[PDB]
């Protein structure tokens, strides 16, 4: 019945106004896979930050995924070098203490010529640190605010003629060049241009930077190999089956668990005070602080909870038809958010922390904002209710999975669905999109993960190692593609995303004994057992506690979390 | 440099295994690299709080019979 | 890939009691040479061979520091750091380069190094407290004595400021490498029969600690001075040409460095 669907598609295009060549080319564009973007997480050499321009996102001014290929102000470009030399009381400290002054002076003198108010920010931001080292010269540089003010100060006008000399060693010059080459587009190239055009280094410089870039290009890692992560498991003990899904913050200092009796429980994962004294020390050591704070603002059971990337606010979604906001440094409620008439099941912040999306029983997802009490977009189009919600890592699309065996990608501005992904056989329960952004992964309640690509919309492959049960959470490797799935069968499994695709991801050159005999025992029967894909590599069981949360930290250490069940 | 006990006995009783290890690398113990577990900043109580509650209940018996 | 009249009162009372106290192991597998791809060990020998040519050394240093995907070679680096430390303990430029690549991996925040903290701290604690580091002083010259002394003190001052970098990179291992390292320094410091450079490394490692621990070495410093400097009833008058193990220059270095760390306890 798929050839008849192809004929219905062709007649739909013919009646909806696509030329025969145009429909053939749109079919050929729909069939081929999304190619590889080499700047996939935007590596810090050729990648830029997002603009902070106070406008909402817009997925327009944008070409297709099928086609092949793919200002930066002075204060942050100096603060990068400032913090990099400030993080070191090493053997190379006072040479950076020497060379930190004329780069600041030349950046200030090159920034007064373009933007005066940014220059007034930049001067007084980094003023009082070397005043005792460089005398009243910075007091002489108070009266420079324009191009004609530079002609008043004779040393500032001489700084264009007198190139500032500095005698630098070879190891310090190579350290500075290999630091300012490893991140160009933050401002390293802007520092390098000032160093090349205004400084006098004692030991041509363009050939030196060419040799730096060529020797840095001569040794890289082209195709990455897999790595098995270390999992730290947080097991919660005295929860009599009344602890819903939990979450960890970033820096992993706070854990938030939503209870069935309308509390949010807040744990300091370091054993810290979690009282935020802030030197006031007024009174009340008479209370009992077990390094754990409770939050009582809900009247229903808390079904989801999400932490801001700022990590100072908590967002709790309940079955009373509100989502509440909590301050993590005074432990009270701030804002109630009322836009649903059914229970709330999955709240999730943006990547940049701008605005949060919500899932509920009313078959619609809702886009919000943390400063608006009522919603901003309604995501309608599912047949059953929405279970999970997640953004694209740029904060520009929304992904919602629902209990009618499908998930959708929504435009965040126009509201209408852009992708519909079909192929599952159970309620989609957890969804996650890779830091590359070209591949979407989700897990159902059938114990089957699968990955599609967002350009073609069809299935690359699936993952068949979990038990016929729920896949509660999902997490991604920070750099590259290794999927960590914490489900309901008490295991945390590890998945290679790049086995059966056109990207093989650098297999080893040269055997085992345990491989292909563990599921060749099959004592329970062939039809009554699971057979794993070739993508599953490892599986860590937890001994009778289930894993509600997997959270892959920055440094190849994942954290799992759950409650000790009996 | 022979008046240290714990370093001299550590030189004597490990003198055979370290020669084999250093001959293996050019191709209790604290430098087997693969079999090491890291340390956690805080782990929770699981057994000490039980005896803490028991001798706290004995302390509530120790306060001359007040409930 | 994992590794595929009764005598039982010693394999149960001191083989599973003095093994369960330092953790537990189930045979992680380092070496069959099938666990690395071709390009991975191409990169491994290309970085281990280069550690006009200082540019390639700094390129290898920054490729260790910033690149990701070397989670498989990180046990093969701590092997080929330790063998080039305990096997080539005479050349100070190679020991400097090995401490540079120790610091370069210790700044890579994309690899997990908390397993390997116990096999990376003895390298730092043995380039700081070695009995000899250069070994070829080229004697019969006071200028060469002073030059070799500064060349071997640069490595003490660098490795001491690499110990403070690893007491702050890993604060989750506090109370597991702060008392261990200060116990190593208190054990190595409290004797008479050591060479001067080991005492200098001990006092600089004391200097890169902080707080009451430095106060913890306040009491046992008087008898340490009375044993290592021989003030047997002296009246502090002929101190320039009185003393017995050391020379005058290194005693002046010791009296300078013992108050270079003592200023921290009187500034608060």
Shape of chain C: globular
Distance between the termini of chain A: 49 Å
* Estimated helix fraction of chain A: 10-25%
The pair of chains with the biggest contact is: A-C, 40 and 42 residues
Summing up helix and strand content along with how strands pair, one would put the structural category of chain C as: mainly alpha
Query: What strand line-up does the widest sheet of chain A have?
Result: 4-5-6-7
Quaternary status of these chains? part of a larger assembly
Per DSSP E runs of 2 or more residues, the count of β-strands of chain C stands at: 0
The helix/strand series of chain C, from N terminus to C terminus, equals: HHHHHHHHHHH
Helix content range of the residues of chain C, please?
A: 40-55%
The radius of gyration of chain A is 28 Å
Radius of gyration of chain C: 22 Å
Distance between the termini of chain C: 54 Å
Strand content of chain A: 25-35%
Q: Number of helical runs of chain A?
A: 12
Strand content of chain C: under 5%
Annotation field: number of helices of chain C: 11
Largest sheet of chain A: 4 strands, antiparallel
User: What is the total number of structural domains of chain C?
Assistant: 1
Structural class of chain A: alpha+beta
Can you give a write-up of this model?
The PDB classes it as gene regulation. Keywords: Coactivator, Transcription, Histone acetyltransferase, Histone deubiquitinase, gene regulation. The structure is cut from a larger assembly and holds chains A (566 residues), B (67 residues) and C (268 residues). Chain A has 566 residues and is an alpha+beta fold. In chain A, strands 4-5-6-7 form a four-stranded antiparallel β-sheet, with no helix packed on it. In chain A, strands 8-9-10-11 form a four-stranded antiparallel β-sheet, with no helix packed on it. A four-stranded antiparallel β-sheet of chain A has the order 12-13-14-15, with no helix packed on it. In chain A, strand 9 (313-318) and strand 10 form a beta hairpin. In chain A, helix 3 (74-86) packs antiparallel against helix 4 (93-111). Helix content of chain B is 49%, strand content 0%. Chain B is elongated. Chain C has 268 residues and is mainly alpha-helical. Chain C has helices at residues 38-48, 54-66, 74-86, 92-105, 121-128, 142-169, 178-189, 196-207, 212-215, 222-228, 248-260. In chain C, helix 7 runs antiparallel to helix 8 and helix 8 (196-207) runs parallel beside helix 11 (248-260). The radius of gyration of chain C is 22 Å and the shape is globular. The B-C interface holds B 1, 3-4, 22, 25-26, 28, 30-41 and C 18-19, 22-30, 75, 78-79, 82-83, 86-87, 114-119, 122, 171-174, 176, 191, 193-194.
């Amino acid at each position: 019945s798929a050839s008849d669907l192809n004929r219905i598609v062709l007649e739909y295009l013919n009646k909806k106004g696509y030329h025969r060549t145009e429909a053939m080319l749109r079919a050929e564009s729909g069939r081929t896979l999304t190619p590889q973007n080499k700047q996939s997480p935007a590596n810090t050499k050729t990648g830029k930050f997002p603009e902070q321009s106070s406008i909402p996102p817009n997925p327009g001014k944008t070409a297709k995924p099928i086609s092949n290929p793919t200002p930066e102000n002075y204060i942050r470009a100096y603060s990068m070098l400032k913090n990099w030399v400030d993080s070191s009381l090493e053997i190379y400290k006072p040479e950076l203490s020497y060379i930190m002054y004329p780069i600041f002076i030349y950046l200030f003198l090159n920034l007064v010529a373009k933007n005066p108010v940014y220059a007034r920010r930049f001067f007084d931001r980094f003023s009082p640190d070397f005043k005792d080292f460089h005398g009243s010269e910075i007091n002489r540089l108070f009266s420079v605010n324009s191009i004609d003010h530079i002609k008043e100060n004779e040393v500032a006008s001489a700084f264009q003629s007198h190139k500032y000399r500095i005698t630098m060693s070879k190891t310090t010059l190579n350290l500075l060049l290999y630091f300012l080459n490893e991140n160009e587009s933050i401002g390293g190239s802007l520092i390098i241009s000032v160093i090349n055009q205004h400084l006098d280094p004692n030991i041509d410089l363009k050939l030196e930077i060419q040799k730096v870039k060529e020797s840095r290009d001569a040794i890289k890692l082209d195709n990455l190999q897999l790595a098995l992560p270390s999992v730290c498991m947080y097991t919660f003990q005295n929860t009599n089956k009344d602890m819903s899904c939990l979450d960890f913050s970033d820096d992993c200092r706070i854990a938030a668990a939503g209870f069935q009796d309308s509390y949010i429980k807040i744990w300091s994962l370091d054993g810290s005070s979690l009282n935020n004294p802030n030197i006031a020390l007024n009174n009340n050591d008479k209370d009992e602080d077990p390094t754990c704070k409770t939050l009582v603002g809900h009247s229903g059971t808390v079904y989801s909870t999400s932490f801001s990337p700022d990590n100072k606010y908590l967002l709790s979604g309940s079955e009373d038809k509100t989502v509440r906001l909590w301050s993590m440094d005074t432990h009270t409620a701030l804002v109630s958010y009322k836009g649903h008439n059914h229970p709330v099941w999955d709240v999730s912040f943006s990547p940049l922390g701008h605005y949060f999306a919500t899932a509920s029983h009313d078959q619609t997802a809702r886009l919000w904002s943390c400063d608006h009490i009522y919603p901003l977009r309604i995501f309608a189009g599912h047949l059953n209710d929405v279970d999970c919600v997640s953004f694209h890592p740029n904060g520009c699309y929304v992904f919602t999975g629902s209990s009618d065996k499908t998930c959708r990608m929504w435009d965040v501005s126009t509201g209408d669905s852009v992708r519909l992904f079909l192929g599952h056989t159970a309620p989609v329960i957890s969804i996650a999109v890779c830091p590359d952004g070209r591949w979407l992964s989700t897990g159902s309640e059938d114990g089957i993960i699968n990955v599609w690509d967002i350009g073609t919309g069809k299935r690359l492959k699936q993952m068949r190692g979990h038990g016929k049960n729920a896949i509660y959470s999902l997490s991604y490797s920070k750099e590259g593609n290794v999927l960590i799935s914490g489900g309901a069968d008490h295991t945390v499994r590890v998945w290679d995303l790049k086995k059966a695709t056109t990207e093989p991801s650098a297999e080893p050159d040269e055997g085992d004994v345990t491989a292909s005999i563990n599921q060749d025992i099959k004592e329970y029967g062939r039809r009554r057992t699971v057979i794993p894909t070739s993508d599953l590599v490892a599986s860590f069981y937890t001994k009778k506690t289930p894993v509600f949360k997997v959270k892959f930290s920055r440094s190849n250490l994942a954290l799992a979390g759950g409650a000790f069940r009996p | 440099d022979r008046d240290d006990l714990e370093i001299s006995v550590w030189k004597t009783v490990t003198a055979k295994v370290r020669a084999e290890i250093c001959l293996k690398r050019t191709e209790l113990q604290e430098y087997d690299i693969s079999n090491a577990i890291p340390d956690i900043v805080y782990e929770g109580v699981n057994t000490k709080t039980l005896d803490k509650m028991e001798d706290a209940s004995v302390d509530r018996m120790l306060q001359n019979g007040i409930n | 890939l994992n590794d595929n009249s009764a005598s039982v009162t010693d394999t149960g009372a001191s083989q599973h009691l003095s093994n369960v106290k330092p953790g537990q192991n189930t045979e992680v597998k380092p070496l069959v040479k099938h666990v690395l791809s071709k390009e991975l060990q191409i990169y491994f020998n290309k970085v281990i061979s280069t550690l006009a040519a200082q540019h390639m050394k700094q390129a290898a240093l920054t490729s260790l520091r910033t690149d990701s995907g070397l989670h498989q070679l990180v046990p093969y680096f701590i092997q080929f750091i330790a063998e080039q430390i305990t096997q080539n303990l005479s050349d100070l430029q190679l020991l400097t380069t090995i401490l540079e690549m120790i610091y370069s991996l210790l700044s890579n925040t994309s690899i997990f190094l908390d397993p390997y903290i116990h096999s990376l701290m003895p390298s730092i604690l043995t380039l700081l407290l070695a009995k000899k580091l250069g070994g070829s002083p080229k004697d019969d010259s006071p200028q060469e004595i002073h030059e070799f002394l500064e060349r071997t003190n640069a490595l003490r001052d660098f490795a001491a400021s690499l110990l403070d970098y690893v007491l702050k990179k890993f604060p989750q291992a506090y109370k597991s490498l702060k008392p261990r390292v200060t116990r190593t320094l208190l054990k190595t410091f409290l004797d008479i029969n050591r060479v001067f450079g080991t005492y200098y490394g001990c006092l600089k490692g004391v200097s890169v600690l902080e707080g009451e621990s430095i106060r913890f070495f306040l009491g046992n410093l008087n008898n340490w001075a009375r044993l290592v400097f021989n003030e047997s009833g002296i009246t502090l008058d002929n101190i320039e040409e009185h003393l017995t193990k050391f020379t005058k220059e290194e005693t002046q270095i010791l009296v300078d460095t013992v108050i270079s760390a003592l200023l921290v306890l009187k500034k608060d």
